[PDB]
Design a protein around this nucleic acid. Structure first.
Ligand code: TE9
Ligand code: TE9
Ligand code: CL
Ligand code: CL
Ligand code: MG
Ligand code: MG
Ligand code: MG
Ligand code: MG
Ligand code: MG
Ligand code: MG
Lengths: 724, 724
DNA sequence: TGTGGAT
DNA sequence: GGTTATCCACA
DNA sequence: GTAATAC
DNA sequence: AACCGTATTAC
């Protein structure tokens, strides 16, 4: 039931037959359609293959996908592996030419290396190579489709005696027709493979264990030593026919590519705006489409489709789940998306699918995007070079700390808990005035996290350690109170639970305590929560020891947990473990760049208008000459030329004069224009002084942070305690 | 496994407890969140409930949803039904306030009427009424939100505290938050219910059997007698508290609403453009978004999400599957969508989901939309009154016959097979010249269907009957050929199969014939089809009788089938069974309206431009005076007034003069404007003649249809034979 | 075991 | 529309 | 026992 | 991403 289904070849022939291991059932379908059914079999992989270096050998051998591979190859598994029983001469791995494709290659290669080594050794395991590019279009009798695998092969194809043709940049196998798949990647005559060889059993064994073994620290080290976070990779001169590569180099190049991508571009937040790329794209796309807080909700499926088609070439379930999370006020301290409909619950009940719900950006989310239209932040080409997207948002509140981040990458993970907006701003403002400020002083403004689920955080020293180093362990404990009853009876009443805990599962875990009588005293467990309030009632038997029961429950259920800070974020393209000081100084440095770039943008605009207004006032004095000149001129371009040469107007002034509508000649009021010149000069002065003076800039930064605080501040929800 | 999961009430209490039967798991989730958990239980319904009047009893008691309803109510079924054992005092049906909601009510009420009648009889079965409208005035005072169920309650709310207020039109329970659901529809204090009463067991029994029984003809008749296809329905008038209604009237109102909707707005094509609403929306939306044949493909999920958000308030799987079908050249003779990726196959393998594929309109589909921008076709408000959509497309080729339609409605179905485009145009052009043309003569141009799957159609007389009446039965038979082998030995080779037949299932069925040895002689069945062509090989045993085998197979497999024509389409809002004559004359009448409206649009545009050009020629002769005049004027309106009074320009001319940009005075070439005057006058004359003379209009209609034919004609694929 | 973006 | 897998780091 | 738009 | 239900008409 759980594995890809094998489409076998029509005829047995272990001399020639090929098993295609295909990334995904949909591309598996295309391969089924495009293949030569006589000798090529198709086994689709349902996403990420089990890591056979990490998992246990019972567990590996109860994995459906692995079993159906061992069945099909018909040769046992290593120890019992008879290459002379093998049903194929080639096992051909065919994935997307993308980073998750690279990962899948890695995982499969570790299975073959670890349990079918003769197969690898004999050079029977191959890879793929789909094209990255398709060029050209000239109708039916076509003369205008070729394919390319490198930028250099692409440059070659651009030279075609034609003009501009069409270029497709392939994102995956799922954009290719079965004809195209066969021609480019499955036909022995025309495909390009990589034969995987072992050049050195010792260097291979090392490289596979470091990349794919249980131990993080060597993999982290390998990544620090090998991955170039601030440089692109050069990428191979694509050789045709077959081309050998060592298991060593394939594993290193593939896992390097994947690692770098999921570190920088998936699971870890940017230190400045606090966003993962998917979250930033959600916000930018919704904002670009005017799906803001002040306008009506818009069908989720529409938002998600625009996000996917314009910015984020990944599954809609990934996009939609991230958008839903941004709407849930038990996950985010300051929700960034407002969602009508079933956006889930603290019981973890499934949110309605995107066909049902509708959404827009929250008001505070607009503050993440404030001044994105004023060239405040670096943009980059989207995935297919049709549109630009921000690499970071202006971020007028410090979202990294306010909403936190929880992610799992390669060689790194991150847990940054949420914080109270007012308190974070208070620390930031202090640090604007005192750049060398120390943790003890900062903690007067920012004493600890502020979970949206409230509860009690215990461990002042551990907060401090986390704020210093990025790592610490604190206790988070449910808010409880005792309530008397009839019968000489008490009940424990829970009104706030720990962050990230599922209420329904907690209730079940507590009820199992009672059922198994692990501790004595429990009469009944009732969830009495409703739409207005969380309320769990643990009703105790007559003369139960309520302290014994409550302490048992703190210890052995998630009624209390440990929260481990592991504060990692992307800073200068590279993952970095950070305390509060780097977090806040990065934010400040970011706001500095934003305010300066905004001020330049606005000043340029005001100067252009000023120069135009000066030109219009001058035009009055020479109106008859200007009209005559324009009438004499051959066209618009010529008229402007004559204005500059004859009368010393700038380009911008000349463009403005020649595009005036005739009816504007009714107005000869220079006084209103002079008033505007003066207003513009005042503004330019203020903007120039912000650019020319660090302290003027910093004082504007504080004024704006204080405004955000005043508008969005809410009371702290979690209480802080020192020890137990 | 297959049923909605019950969320029970906390405390048993048959006096007060309520079972909510909720349309869909997602709204079931919202109901779970919004309820009062003490007495309200939630049983979600997974879509359409089994029709307990139609289906067997084997099937009814094998149905998971029905069984879990019987279980939960706790009162046996039918014969053994004890109302004093019932676990709820109220069974409350809560659906979307939409047509499929109405259908679900209908199906449930038939179950309770037939197998829990005492429950209905005692007035314990109710229907929750969700609001249609929410009215709001944004952030502020308090947020300010009231609800409405009728247009009259809506009109009231417009006054109330409304003016600069936003109105949400609810499309489903899926757009409501759990607190909104409780306030409006689940709280006993504030909800409005309908108690379902039996006023008359005899009238009820009849009304349930006609609407829900397996006999179509009475239902068809009931629909003809009761449903008003060309009138709106009256508003309910919504009373407070509970309000009783007879099972008779409920069933009639609800099933009438459903019937009309799926007849007019779902399963049946419009006779003019040949489209179902979902298909027309796919085309209009993709065309509006510039997703045409000449431009880059676009991610399917983007198209689909725009279609859903702007036009088609239904599931993405419905939309995407319809788009995919429009792309499959074994379903459509002239594909309307071009789709890259896995768009399925003749084996029925699942198309890739919308996250993988990308799409655009085909070139010929552009001809369905030609001149949509020239006020050629009636538009109507979309589902939420934000955007207009066409009720029918201009349709520059007769798509109803060319691409056909297969559909299943209420009381009616449709099968219209595909046809060859050139042939259909030939018939249409003949009929333009010979309005009273008869079937025998039309069939010289249009001899029969042309399936995109080819094969052999047999039964000339039955084609003629179908072309006369809309109904007939023809044989469709696979194209076959014999091939010799070494061993002397023969094989039957199939290269074309019947329309709508799955190849893989046919192959399997033939192989079962071999295995069961129903006819002597079959050695092996092999599908040897590949990307370049269909080829199924039936290898016979030495000295098998080819003809005996082939005859067995035609008779007892789908290697040959009957195609039953049942040509139903919507004509003047009403379903109608139609032969070729009404189909073609409707088309012609449609193109007449289009060409006339286009000609009026273009003529009006030319006349406006002509008047402007006349004024611009006059301006040039008095340009100095005009510029001086404008300079003497106080403002735009004064300048125009001075132009009218001093020089007799019209309003339109004056507005055009005074909004000229100064650079436009570089071009005062009166001869070029005179040339333009002449060209415009010639065009107006041509356009006027089309409007003033039917034959001029019909000649243009034929010229255009012949151009389409010349561009898009392809040879016949199906062969026709006279005897079956 | 479970967190959250991915296949 | 629920259900069912995997990866990755870190308790 | 399957077709195609719906839940 | 496969797999699994139902309505509706008509063979
Ligand atoms: N849970 C619910 N599902 C459906 N529903 C919708 C489907 C779709 O939109 O494409 C679909 O393909 C589908 C397949 C099914 F097999 C199916 N049934 C299997 C049984 O468990 C349910 C159901 Cl019901 C299905 C619904 F429309 C509403 C629902 F709440
Ligand atoms: N067939 C394939 N599916 C996945 N895949 C994608 C999911 C998603 O996009 O949200 C998902 O939620 C999901 C759940 C699963 F339980 C699941 N497995 C159950 C086993 O049968 C497979 C798989 Cl694998 C899943 C894939 F990414 C690629 C696929 F080909
Ligand atoms: Cl101006
Ligand atoms: Cl003009
Ligand atoms: Mg991919
Ligand atoms: Mg998923
Ligand atoms: Mg604990
Ligand atoms: Mg609905
Ligand atoms: Mg479906
Ligand atoms: Mg037959």
């Amino acid at each position: 039931l759980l594995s890809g289904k094998l489409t076998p070849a029509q005829s047995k022939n272990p001399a020639k037959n090929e098993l295609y291991l295909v990334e995904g059932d949909s591309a598996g379908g295309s391969a089924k359609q495009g293949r030569d059914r006589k000798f090529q079999a198709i086994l689709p992989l349902r996403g990420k293959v089990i890591n056979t270096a990490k998992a246990k050998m019972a567990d590996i051998l109860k994995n459906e996908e692995i079993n159906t591979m061992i069945y099909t190859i018909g040769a046992g598994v290593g120890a019992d592996f008879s290459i002379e029983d093998a049903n194929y001469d080639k096992i051909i791995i065919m994935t997307d030419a993308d980073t998750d494709g690279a990962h899948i290659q890695t995982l499969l290669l570790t299975f073959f290396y670890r349990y079918m080594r003769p197969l690898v050794e004999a050079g029977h395991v191959y890879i793929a190579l789909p094209p990255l590019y398709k060029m050209s279009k000239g109708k039916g009798k076509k003369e205008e489709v070729a394919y390319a695998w490198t930028d250099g092969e692409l440059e070659e194809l651009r030279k075609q005696f034609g003009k501009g043709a069409t270029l497709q940049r392939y994102k995956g196998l799922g954009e290719m027709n079965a004809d195209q798949l066969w021609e480019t990647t499955m036909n022995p005559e025309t495909r390009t493979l990589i034969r995987v060889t072992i050049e050195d059993l010792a260097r291979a064994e090392r490289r596979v264990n470091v990349l794919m073994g249980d131990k993080v620290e060597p993999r982290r080290k390998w990544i620090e030593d090998n991955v170039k976070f601030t440089l692109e990779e050069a990428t191979v001169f694509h050789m045709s026919n077959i081309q050998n590569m060592s298991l060593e180099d394939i594993m290193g190049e593939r896992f390097g590519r994947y690692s770098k991508y999921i570190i920088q571009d998936r699971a870890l937040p940017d230190i400045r705006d606090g966003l993962k790329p998917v979250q930033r794209r959600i916000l930018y796309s919704m904002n670009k489409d005017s799906n803001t807080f002040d306008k009506s909700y818009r069908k989720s499926a529409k938002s998600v489709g625009n996000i996917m088609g314009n910015f984020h070439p990944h599954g809609d379930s990934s996009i939609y789940d991230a958008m839903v999370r941004m709407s849930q006020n038990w996950k985010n301290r300051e929700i960034l998306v407002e969602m009508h409909g079933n956006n889930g619950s603290m019981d973890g009940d499934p949110p309605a699918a995107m066909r049902y719900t509708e959404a827009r950006l929250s008001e505070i989310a607009g503050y993440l995007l404030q001044d994105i239209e004023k060239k405040t932040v670096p943009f980059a080409w989207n995935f297919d070079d049709t549109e630009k997207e921000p690499t970071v948002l202006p971020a007028a509140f410090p979202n990294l700390l306010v909403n936190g981040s929880t992610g799992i990458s390669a060689g790194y993970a991150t847990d940054i808990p949420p914080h109270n907006l007012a308190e974070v701003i208070d620390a930031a403002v202090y640090m604007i005035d005192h750049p060398t400020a120390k943790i003890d002083k900062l903690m007067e403004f920012l004493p600890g996290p502020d979970f949206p689920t409230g509860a009690i955080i215990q461990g002042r020293d551990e907060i401090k350690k986390a704020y210093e180093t990025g790592k610490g362990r604190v206790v988070v404990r449910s808010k409880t109170e005792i309530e008397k009853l009839k019968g000489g009876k008490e009940q424990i009443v829970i009104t706030e639970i720990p962050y990230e805990i599922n209420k329904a599962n907690l209730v079940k875990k507590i009820d199992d305590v009672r059922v198994n009588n692990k501790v004595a005293g429990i009469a009944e467990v009732r969830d009495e929560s409703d739409r207005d309030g969380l309320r769990i009632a643990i009703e105790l038997k007559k003369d139960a020891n309520t302290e014994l029961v409550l302490n048992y429950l703190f210890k052995y259920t998630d009624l209390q947990i440990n929260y481990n800070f592991n504060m990692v974020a992307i800073d200068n393209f590279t993952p970095r473990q950070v305390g509060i000081v780097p977090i806040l100084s990065s934010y400040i440095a970011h706001r500095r760049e934003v305010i300066l770039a905004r001020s330049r943008f606005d000043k340029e605009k005001a100067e252009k208008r000023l120069h135009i207004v000066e030109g219009l006032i001058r035009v009055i004095s020479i109106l008859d000459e200007v009209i005559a000149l324009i009438r004499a001129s051959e066209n618009k371009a010529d008229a402007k030329e004559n204005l500059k040469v004859s009368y010393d107007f700038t380009e911008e002034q000349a463009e403005a004069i020649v595009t005036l509508q005739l009816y504007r000649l009714t107005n000869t009021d220079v006084v209103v224009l002079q008033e505007e010149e003066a207003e513009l000069r005042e503004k330019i002065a203020m903007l120039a002084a912000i650019i020319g003076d660090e302290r003027t800039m910093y004082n504007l930064m504080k004024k704006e942070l204080r405004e955000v605080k005043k508008k969005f501040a809410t009371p702290r929800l979690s209480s802080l305690e020192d020890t137990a």
